[PDB]
């Protein structure tokens, strides 16, 4: 009766349907996962989950001719979440190309691919994730955005040797790639008031483009416009 599987497709919610081909001979038809043999499903998906958990790009390239890329595992992780935590910017760029849901959320912890690239410390990956338009703002079960995460871990990286080093670099590169997304450096019209003293000086800032004035730490301002201010003071 049933010959082989040839396609997947998300029906309902995290529920699956496969495209079957036939030995009795008739035109290939869609059919619920709940309605088809274990191994025959397993035989279509295992080559897939192997490929991913080892970030095999070539393989993945082929196993996609007609496949629903956002298939989940036991913990609601899609293929993408894997290649992300492994640090394969090349894979990630490929599955993105395949329309994968960048903003997908797992069900053990509530994470996205950027929570993986973050946690697993893959900069060049995040780089790409953001390039292709991911949303950095997505929180998880712990309420953490991806950035707050890189902040937290780097709190607790070791300071031992050049092994424990490329770790610290990593978190910084991520934490800065991410910052360069939350934070712009917009030009100042005027600097209205001065608070704090010496170095911990905090300046009240008027924006050229519009809207409120706001206390920027004296660090997060320009040495050229901070001077222009305390000169008008004298």
């Amino acid at each position: 009766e049933v010959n082989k599987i040839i396609g997947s497709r998300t029906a309902g919610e995290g529920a699956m349907e496969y495209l079957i081909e036939w030995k009795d001979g008739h035109s290939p038809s869609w059919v619920p996962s709940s309605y088809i043999a274990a191994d025959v499903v397993s035989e279509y998906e295992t080559p897939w989950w192997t490929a991913a958990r080892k970030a095999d790009e070539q393989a993945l390239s082929q196993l996609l001719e007609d496949r629903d890329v956002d298939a989940v595992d036991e913990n609601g992780r899609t293929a993408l979440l894997f290649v992300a935590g492994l640090g394969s910017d090349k894979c990630v760029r490929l599955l993105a190309e395949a329309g994968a849901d960048l903003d997908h959320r797992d069900m053990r912890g509530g994470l996205t691919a950027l929570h993986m690239a973050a946690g697993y410390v893959r900069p060049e990956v995040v780089e790409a994730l953001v390039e292709l338009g991911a949303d950095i703002e997505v929180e998880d079960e712990r309420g953490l955005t991806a950035l707050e995460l890189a902040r937290e871990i780097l709190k607790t990286t070791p300071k031992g040797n050049p092994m424990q080093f490329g770790r610290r670099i990593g978190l910084e590169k991520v934490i800065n790639v991410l910052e360069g997304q939350v934070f712009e450096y917009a030009e100042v019209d005027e600097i209205v008031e001065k608070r704090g003293k010496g170095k911990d000086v905090e300046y009240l800032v008027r924006w050229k483009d519009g809207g409120d004035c706001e206390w920027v730490k004296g660090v997060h301002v320009a040495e050229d416009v901070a001077k222009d201010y305390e000169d008008g003071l004298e």
């Binding site: 934070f183 450096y185 917009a186 997060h220 040495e223 050229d224």
Partner: peptide, 13 residues
């Protein structure tokens, strides 16, 4: 990590 000339850090909106 110095701020560009004539600018200051804010959140993106």
């Amino acid at each position: 990590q110095k701020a560009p000339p004539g600018t200051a850090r804010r959140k993106r909106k």
